[PDB]
Amino acid sequence: VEALERDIISQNPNVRWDDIADLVEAKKLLKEAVVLPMWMPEFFKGIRRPWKGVLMVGPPGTGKTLLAKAVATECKTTFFNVSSSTLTSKYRGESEKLVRLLFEMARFYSPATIFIDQIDSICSEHEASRRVKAELLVQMMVMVLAATNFPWDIDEALRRRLEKRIYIPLPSAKGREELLRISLRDLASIAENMEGYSGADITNVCRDASLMAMRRRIEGLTPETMEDFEMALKKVSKSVSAADIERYEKWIFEFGSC
Template sequence: MAAANNMRNIVSNEILVKENNVQWDDVIGNAAAKDALRKTIVLPVEQGRHFPVESVLLFGAPGTGKTLLVRALASQCSAFFFQLSTSMLTSKYSGYKIHLLKTLFDMAKEQPSIVFLDDIEMISTCEHDNDVVISQIQLEIIRQMHQIARDSAAHVAIIAATNRPREVDSDILELFTARIHIQFLNIEERMELFKKLLEQHGCNVLTENEVKEIANLTTDYTGSDLALVVRIASIEPIRDLLNTGNWEENTSRLRSIQTRDFYAALNETKPSVPPDEIKSFYTFSEHCCGDG
């Protein structure tokens, strides 16, 4: 009994996300992915039907917003949100991995919940030498997901995410009835993100044409890459002031951010995802999702 309570405490304190303020409008772009999740999970909840039992795999490059999207989904559904990086099952939680998984899913079934299994490729056999341990984890996840699918009283949506979909074992891949490609932002979406990031930095002074000019230069940048660009550009005026050597005397003369600051930032930052890797996600999507 004490061991069971201890395991519940671990799940409650380390996996259950107690504060989740991400809203649907916080997720910029990926309209197709948002629409698919809205139809399968959000709408049934809003229409007063039972919380749907769904299994969805999100795949795409690092920094494209997969985790943000799932957090917004949980918030939109007012669901309990459990977030587990599966890599932890072979590291931090390795000594009690199966017990942890059982407890996690048992707790999720107690109320409408979203279980988010991040880095799902980390429980693939190609990632580890110890196939026995990985097989144990895979079998437990498969067993739990099958139980949820058969349990009419369970209202649990299971969302997994991966940056390396080709490395997900086929037995795990087949568990997910929906597979959604989280793509890079188009130019309009990049402009929207730039405006939002500039506002967060308190430097929303660029014109529409200037924002478009910068967005045109960042085609292969992820959302995380763009956030880094804005962060670096926003400190360029401070760098200029520091170079005068009279910081304390000149703080009142700190200039506003300008387009040249973004050019300087782009010289310091390059897209984090190589073109061949970007192409591989579209190839996977065509083969495994039926996208043409």
């Protein structure tokens, strides 16, 4: 199916750079994307070129899929929001040669970016998954970006194809402080308290801390806040264990250029 590719994947129109805090990661993803540079080596000189594959690896809740659009929007490229899990699911019939055709569509549109979310979920209809991996290989001007919350389950075959591998981490004490701000409009001691908490764990621990405690004590007593935070801060987990965070750091030491 050609026409239906255009409405969902080809265009989910991206137009922003700096958003949702995460200032430390955005920078890193901005130093390796090198937009103000990257247009130029693309333009005229060879021997020095864009990365033949960029793998974003890291913990969830960092929203790397947003960071994809955030890169493609600055280089003024046509953006492709292709899920890796979507090709195996939505197209059983030999329509998977449409990975190749997809790349052909990218070449057609001069500036292009092909983001593949959930790369890890490929080898995991096995035969279909085997075919699509092959089409992805033979295909790999444009730009190709990948994303995985499980870098370890990426096979060594597609891994090598990824030239640049970068770690997209959780918000540090400064992001999680400002995420606290965004979720509310005293925040300092709360932010530095414990690492690991992702933006989602933050933007909900606020809500508990906000009124699940506040209203409860005004609805509790008679008719006729900082304490609540720490109280309801330990009624939520991080959903990313220190050991799991320890895992990403290890993978990026052994396969990533950090």
